[PDB]
């Protein structure tokens, strides 16, 4: 674990784990180094800071500048290409999003939301975190605003799929046993036009582009739960 | 000796924070993906471990390797107890541990695979 590491040891670890040992072609690409920096920042924020809250919360760009200093081969070169790094990483981070994967009792159906447009895809009910609320309270609020359902008495803070795609972190709480006859309605959302159950085995493994990344971990989770229930 | 100091720079301190028993890094391969052979099911499974591969020796000169996982803090540190249990099959390094517990390693660069195979055999040479 990282509980006893100094901040410098953390950056040393992230440098070795993401950028120091890369093949030459990847290591000389601003773009490819940035994809490594984005994953290192995710690892730092979602794994390392969890084990040591004394470590500072860092913005993607501040993080990148600090990391470069721990990759001997790259600090000076990163300074020469500073504008390119500033440019690539600008606007890459997004406000964390939380919501839920609501399943019925049998765990065969899930609630998905969609807009009115033909081009609009289905997604799980979710939204941006506010400055005050916990990750769990954000999911409860978002699910309520988009589906009219209050999941507060059912949400389990330890059962979720937390997915990061580039700079967008999406944490969805897994909530089974939601009654199929629940009356869903969009309370204050103009962008939510349909709230419907979907049979999980009908979903592709495209109108389901946003949903597809969650399907493998969700199916593994359900499989584990079905085995544990039996 | 210069190339050995170069590969140990930073990396050794990193590995020793997690595994202080590691004495030195022998070789490195970038982007190694780990697979596991499910005996009884007779199928390979791609694990979630992918990262830098470090061939290492411990403070007792025993040879092993660490894969410093990009996907989670859970790394993989195994020993290579008998050189004959490591086989280069097609594009992969196959590592057998006595009780039919088999892992497969895919190294991004094909030249690392054949160099690491040799270095495993010679690091274990008595």
């Amino acid at each position: 674990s990282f509980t006893n590491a100094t901040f410098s040891q953390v950056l040393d670890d992230l440098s070795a784990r993401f950028i120091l040992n890369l093949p030459a072609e990847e290591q000389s690409s601003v773009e490819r180094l940035c994809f490594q920096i984005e994953q290192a920042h995710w690892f730092y924020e979602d794994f390392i800071r969890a084990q040591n809250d004394q470590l500072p919360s860092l913005g993607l760009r501040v993080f990148s500048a600090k990391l470069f200093a721990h990759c001997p081969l790259l600090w000076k070169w990163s300074k020469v290409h500073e504008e390119a790094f500033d440019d690539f990483l600008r606007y890459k981070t997004r406000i964390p999003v939380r919501g839920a994967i609501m399943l019925d009792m049998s765990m065969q159906q899930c609630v998905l939301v969609k807009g009115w447009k033909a081009s609009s895809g289905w997604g799980f009910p979710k939204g941006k975190i506010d400055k005050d609320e916990s990750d769990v309270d954000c999911a409860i609020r978002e699910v309520y605003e988009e589906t009219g359902f209050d999941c507060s008495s059912r949400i389990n803070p330890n059962e979720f799929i937390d997915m990061t795609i580039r700079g967008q972190n999406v944490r969805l709480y897994i909530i089974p046993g939601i009654s199929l006859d629940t009356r869903f309605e969009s309370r204050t959302r103009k962008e939510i036009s349909k709230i419907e159950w979907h049979n999980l085995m009908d979903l592709p493994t495209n109108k389901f582009y946003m949903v597809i990344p969650f399907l493998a971990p969700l199916k593994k989770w359900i499989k584990k739960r079905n085995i544990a229930n039996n | 000796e210069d190339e050995n100091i170069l590969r140990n720079a930073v990396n050794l301190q990193v590995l020793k924070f997690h595994y202080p028993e590691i004495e030195s890094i022998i070789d490195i391969a970038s982007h190694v993906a780990v697979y596991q052979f499910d005996v009884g099911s007779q199928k390979w499974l791609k694990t979630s471990i992918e990262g830098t591969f470090f061939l290492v020796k411990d403070q007792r000169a025993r040879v092993g390797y660490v894969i410093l996982n990009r996907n989670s803090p859970e790394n993989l540190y195994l020993f290579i107890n008998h050189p004959s249990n490591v086989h280069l099959v097609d594009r992969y390094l196959i590592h057998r541990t006595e009780n039919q517990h088999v892992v497969g390693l895919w190294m991004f660069d094909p030249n690392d695979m054949s160099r690491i195979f040799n270095i495993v055999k010679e690091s274990l040479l008595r």
């Binding site: 093949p23 490819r32 994809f35 997915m163 990061t164 795609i165 | 052979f37 199928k43 390979w44 196959i94």
Partner: peptide, 25 residues
């Protein structure tokens, strides 16, 4: 679970490409 999805330079093959370890005996 805590998962990451992003573009990679490396493309590791699917598990089906690996050979059956016939040295098992």
């Amino acid at each position: 679970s805590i998962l990451y999805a992003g573009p990679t330079f490396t493309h590791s093959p699917a598990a089906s490409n690996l050979p059956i370890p016939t040295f098992l005996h």
